[PDB]
Amino acid sequence: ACQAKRGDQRCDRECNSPGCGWDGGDCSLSVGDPWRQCEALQCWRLFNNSRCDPACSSPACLYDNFDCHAGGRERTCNPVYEKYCADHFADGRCDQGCNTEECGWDGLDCASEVPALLARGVLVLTVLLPPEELLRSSADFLQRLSAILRTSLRFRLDAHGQAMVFPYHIGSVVMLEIDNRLCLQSPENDHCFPDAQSAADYLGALSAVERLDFPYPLRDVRGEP
């Protein structure tokens, strides 16, 4: 069929199927099988349906795309508040309208007194945008990824306190940390990513089912210690 397109670093939706391994990972952000630990085989078919499928709700089964956890309107940030929340994310001022997991938690501006509770590892993203361009809309980038993962995302900082965004050899290699300080601030506090690979698999699963709404040329994702 299309063996010449498997792992060709270009997503081809005609080859994007579990049989063809999500176009050799090209359509699942380099994640081989986002459902590789999922105990039920046909969970991916139910991942995109906007309904709770309890048999697919385990962490191994990628929380059934949070449709058991966030069943109602709270599943998404309001689009009328989406530009405002991107503009006011991590600006050092508490904006309560953006202080929800679905809107990106205002980049933790309302929770400066809650200690960091980082997930294990670093989330590594290759974005086909130069570092300068990527950081020119970094608050928007983090806010949107925070909103998708339903947790707080920030750039990992180096010894000199600089964001770990490196040129890709064209693009960027972005290093992110996951701060679960408000994820674990209940109500259902079990729908929290314990590590960067868990988050990378979930993002791969969204890209595989074409339900990832991220306005950036995101090539791949992985978790690294």
């Epitope: 630990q37 962490p59 058991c68 069943g71 109602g72 259902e188």
Partner: antibody
Framework: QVQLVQSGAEVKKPGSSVKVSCKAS????????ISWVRQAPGQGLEWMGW????????HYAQKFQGRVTITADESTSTAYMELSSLRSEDTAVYYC?????????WGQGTLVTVSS | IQMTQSPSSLSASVGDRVTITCRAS??????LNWYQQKPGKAPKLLIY???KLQSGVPSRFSGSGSGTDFTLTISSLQPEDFATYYC?????????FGQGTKVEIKR
């Protein structure tokens, strides 16, 4: 403070059915899941399933498929576990717990005894 | 997923460092919880996600491990710590528990 209060101990004959209740107080059980876990006399713990009362979705352990019915009444902040075709092996303390994957909050446990 | 605890019974004294191990039949990453239970009482969550201490749980309780091997350590064992301890995987359905470690007083 959040508390889960269960119904009183039950005595049942084989083949009968039991319905145990669990009332949540303090928290408004709209944003949570209620789980059912049992413990036979000298034995360990066994998860039976769960319910998210906000949208009424339930999940069960395969071995309890068809015999267990988990429901909830939003207005009273109450979850129910109904177990049918009762056997002597069903004699246990049945716990109501909050959280799906891990449980911080527990009920006191309802003792059910199946004996002819 | 089969959870195996070791030992099943442990004898200790007040002040002792106590270690309880939990073996999962397959890798569960860090999706493991530890519970304490006293007779006629409901279990109590101590540790969630292998090493995270639940709020309101004394700091003398610590969890470690990843994959298939996990450890619950009680540093200066207090009188109120004599109870049964259970590990629990939360990676796949059904949620499964270890068969328990009873911690009794040495004499």
């Amino acid at each position: 403070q959040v508390q889960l209060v269960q119904s009183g101990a039950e005595v049942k004959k084989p083949g009968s059915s039991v319905k145990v209740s669990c009332k949540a107080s303090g928290g408004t059980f709209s944003s949570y899941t209620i789980s059912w876990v049992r413990q036979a006399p000298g034995q360990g713990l066994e998860w039976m399933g769960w319910i998210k009362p906000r949208w009424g979705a339930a999940h069960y352990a395969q071995k309890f498929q068809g015999r267990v019915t988990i429901t909830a009444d939003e207005s009273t902040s109450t979850a129910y576990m109904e177990l049918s075709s009762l056997r002597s092996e069903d004699t246990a303390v049945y716990y109501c717990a909050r959280g799906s994957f891990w449980f911080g909050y527990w009920g006191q446990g309802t003792l059910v005894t199946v004996s002819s | 997923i089969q959870m195996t605890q070791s030992p099943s019974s442990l004898s200790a004294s007040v002040g002792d460092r106590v270690t309880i191990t939990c073996r999962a039949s397959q890798g569960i990453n860090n999706y493991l919880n530890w519970y304490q239970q006293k007779p006629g009482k409901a279990p109590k969550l101590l540790i969630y996600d292998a090493s995270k201490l639940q709020s309101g749980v004394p700091s003398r309780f610590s969890g470690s491990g990843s994959g298939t091997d996990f450890t619950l350590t009680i540093s200066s064992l207090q009188p109120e710590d004599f109870a049964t301890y259970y590990c629990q995987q939360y990676l796949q359905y059904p949620m499964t528990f270890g068969q328990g470690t009873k911690v009794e007083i040495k004499r």
